[model samples]
Target: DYQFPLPQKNSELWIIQKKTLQDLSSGKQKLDSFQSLESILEILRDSKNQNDEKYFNLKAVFEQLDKEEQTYFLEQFIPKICQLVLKIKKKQLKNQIPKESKIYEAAFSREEISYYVSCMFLCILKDQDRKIYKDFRLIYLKDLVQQINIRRQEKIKCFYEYLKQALDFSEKESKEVVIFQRINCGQLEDYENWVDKLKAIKLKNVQLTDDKLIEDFPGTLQVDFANCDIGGGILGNGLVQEEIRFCVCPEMLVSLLVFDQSMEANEVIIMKGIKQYSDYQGYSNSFRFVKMGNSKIQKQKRTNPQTILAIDALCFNSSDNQFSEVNVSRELNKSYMGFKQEDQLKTISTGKWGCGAFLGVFDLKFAIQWIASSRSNKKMIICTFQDEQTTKQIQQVFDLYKQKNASIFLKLVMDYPNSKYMEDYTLLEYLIELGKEKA
Candidate 1:
């Protein structure tokens, strides 16, 4: 009845200039109507050609390129990119663009989203619905383009590098937008005994590695340490794990346009198909594009598209209430929702999910995630990302519990206030020490 994934057989989804591209190209017309689109069209009419650039204010990026690259970006790239975007600029397409506050899913191809993020990168598309949060303009583009500081410059540089690759992509590439539902496990009549379901979830099938989650693990679901709002400062100044990952794959950035801050408390936003771009270094202020050479990188017409499960972790004032029954169950449920219903129960590549800024502990997150993945009947690898010590502790736990279930791990934490958690043993050590006593 309704279009499930976007661009379905019959789904209209956005536009243009003083003389819009339609006027210029003489495209097929439906005479449909929409208003705010004029903002996009108005800005587009200013720069119709790349060779003789108009008012794009892209010189900051233009200067970085040699004659050949500049020609492609301005002349070939701008007009061509606009046309692809123009494919959706009408009243029909406007209705197709999904919103964050909505409760459904949408699938946008690499090129389909080019319109949203492309305009965003080039600073064309602006703000939002009365409320579903359209700050991509101010938070994402304006800040990156204004050059108020150096970090934004790096973000843009990486963006341009990705765009150049975009110019070479064919129309067949794919990316999907899935707005996952929350797991209110408590809503059912069996809710009182739901914790029993977790006991069968063993702590086996866990691996620890130093590789960052961005590494292509074809068929693996990578965990994103995201805020419930998603993209967590990607358009703004924050450049931690989530921002860094989103910046490289600007296609994922379009999710911001469709999603709002009201994502359900227990829900997760699972976005698939991330296109990799420039390899860069540093984080935040020091974050800048290493300016990876075109020769060093391979064309990212990725054969193995990725799957990312975005679960916004908890932000606590302190660790005191962090492991309370209420909080731990929240993490368990959040991870459970993301891992529960994957059509393909692929391993989840995760590490340091909420340990940074969000103030979550590594050992606890590793344990919580392990329980979730195990219960889902899927194996998972912890992409340590230079966390050498934690990896050691993780292996120790896995070895100790190679033949045990999550209940054993649960008992140690649940008995915490009773034992005061052995006073000073780290959770990892505490688990082992208390675990020995339970045997």
Candidate 2:
């Protein structure tokens, strides 16, 4: 029986463990422990590791084992490892301070506990175990070293520095594998009504094109708008777009591991781009494109360093406050920074970004568009997923403003005084007033 004493009060290990757990649970620290666990579960469940390098590199060692050994690892050893982690968590919780206590309390959050305990379980496996291959040590020890480093550096408040160092190395390695092609823009003619309106305006009918081709960059890239939570479902419950959940999440997960780093919101993440291996007919629960050696038009090979801009939206609470300039100004600046002035691929392919899921007003989004485009002098292929009537109204508004001036339109929207409770003088009313002024 193994006998390791309980962490003594005020001991170094005890304090470190306590603080580590606290930081993890409180969002003071960032790690994809749950994502890693889910990845492990997927490997065990599928009985095949998709050969993704972002997860634990145990697959190589796992593949070398006999079928019986593999089954045992999945059915017994992995579950036991999970169990041991839970037990440690329960023990730690039992020692928690009273809620009323003034002293700060520290405890392991679920993901944090799971990650460390899993690491411990791997450490328990014999280095000389012949049932598994020697490569297992590489995976096992890598995590252990990372843990030690995180703990050591976290105390010094320089964990981010460690992460930066790792990121630098990963960027260097990916330079050899990534390529960038000339960027182009096209529309997704998903809306027939909108298309007809464009035709009426004598605008060239730009057919729907793939977003990937539009976003491809030469050296490094930045996506202007992404959710604050990158790869949303890694914590278990959130958005599950397959492109993000499977492709973006896994690739980002791998990049963080390469740097031995954790993800933080409002920060840009530089990572290697992923290859598309599957074809999906729909957004979720789609079929994987598994026809080997078949060339999928979207899956054309390209190597390019990708940068993601991680700015989240501020939802509008009511209609009257929808077109607030204060909020619009911040977003404009954020977009400008992401849309670096000198980037060769100056065009941004975006849709009704914050307007849809974020409850942002349509007018506010267009304001951001105007400000960013005007300031950056960058072309934006704005896609409005709306019907003919709405598209016509938008086009009419653009024409009205073009005839007058953008500054006049901006001033009316930004400075016009209207009753907060009364719904009479709205954006449409102001548009009408502006139209009257023009007449």
Candidate 3:
């Protein structure tokens, strides 16, 4: 029989654990109590039940701690757990477990231990108070989690590893490559002011009108959408259609409508990776998915390969003031959290997000500028999916800020389509244009 102490029903430790949970839930206790915290940690460290019904709710427990307590707990506990997990891994490698070892009897595995550590780490990183990129220990912990083979853990680990590497790379001096490509439907007088502004910034007088002239950035990138939750489908009679129908119309629209309902406003979802499913052709309702080959390998070769669906806030009324500081602030935070910063030198290709289809009038220039300011040390590629006139308007605004902050290098890719209305261009069109552009 296993030598570990199994909690008896209504026993002292069990009652303590039960009471601690109640106290934490009811705000009757603080994690400051070392004994109580220790008791809780022990239970979490030893729990064998992977199912929610029997497993300890680590998120709940962590959430109950105040910010300071949360930081303190993570700083103190995570390292210990990391060391413990490493020991477990070494022991398992040696095949030294006795037939009656408590680990096997309790169903403990290295994978599960690393999973618990990862959950704890994610909870900490998600806290706004924590400076995730600067903390070397946390970065190491993240690397360890990535080395393990859990589905969600692997994805998050890959994302964070890329993020850390990019952050590190930005601190050192490197060559700067910026491409400005403009796709114009027609010339407008407003472009004169934009040109003047670029001249003021000392940007080369040469203008590349061809979209193909822009060099392609390598690696996977995300396309952010200001999405909504409506079960009526993107084409059906629902508010969701009003917000997204024009933005991701036809095939892309249908695919999103059918996607699993696992989205939230502040969260982002990556749709493609090293594998390709099917391709869609045509526009609007006529669009359909066709069989394809080598799509996976093709996707892997291109930079900015992945589609990241980011949900945006809904505007109840067109007349409602949408550009309030509060509104923009929320959107800014959402974008900051949603965008993966791991691409480093690669560009984040996007345009006029939430401005159209969602009936939002927020200034795209200001939004992009603010986002760029937040990640001051990084560079981004801004695609303006607009008419020549609208593109010029954006360019004029961008040119007014003469102060060049080395922290961020901005490359503007002005996309001019024949369509007067921005909604006329579908998500598929934008993606295809981005993929085709060579470096």
On TM-score, the leading prediction is: 1
Q: For residues 1-439, write the lDDT of model 1, one tens digit per residue.
A: 2111221212222222413434423433221221222233334423243332222223444556787776555445555655654566432222232333333455666766665555565354432233232223333223333443355556667776666666676655434332322222222212224367756666659888875554445567777788877788776676888888777766777666555444456556777666566677766666777644444223432334566778888887674566667778778777777776565846887778798888887778887888778777788888877778788777877888765777656666656545777578778877777557767
Worst 10 residues of 1 by lDDT: 1-10
- Stretches > 4 Å off in candidate 1: 1-59, 89-103, 127-148, 174-194, 290-301, 435-439
For model 2, how does the per-residue alpha-carbon lDDT over 184-291 read when each residue is reduced to its tens digit? 112212223222322222211112222333233323233434454433332222222312323322233322111111222112222324332222232222322222
Give lDDT per model, in order: 0.60, 0.36, 0.33
Give the better candidate number (2 or 3) by lDDT. Answer: 2
Candidate 2 steric clashes: 7
| lDDT tens digits, residue span 338-408, model 3 | 44333442445444556655676534333333343334333344444335654554444344332542112
By TM-score, rank the candidates, best first: 1, 2, 3
Give the local distance difference test score of model 1.
0.60
Candidate 2's TM-score reads 0.44
Clashes of each: 13, 7, 7
Best-matching candidate per lDDT: 1
Give me the runs in candidate 2 sitting further than 4 Å from their true place: 1-224, 240-249, 254-296, 301-308, 315-320, 386-389, 402-406, 415-439
Output the TM-score of candidate 3. Answer: 0.35
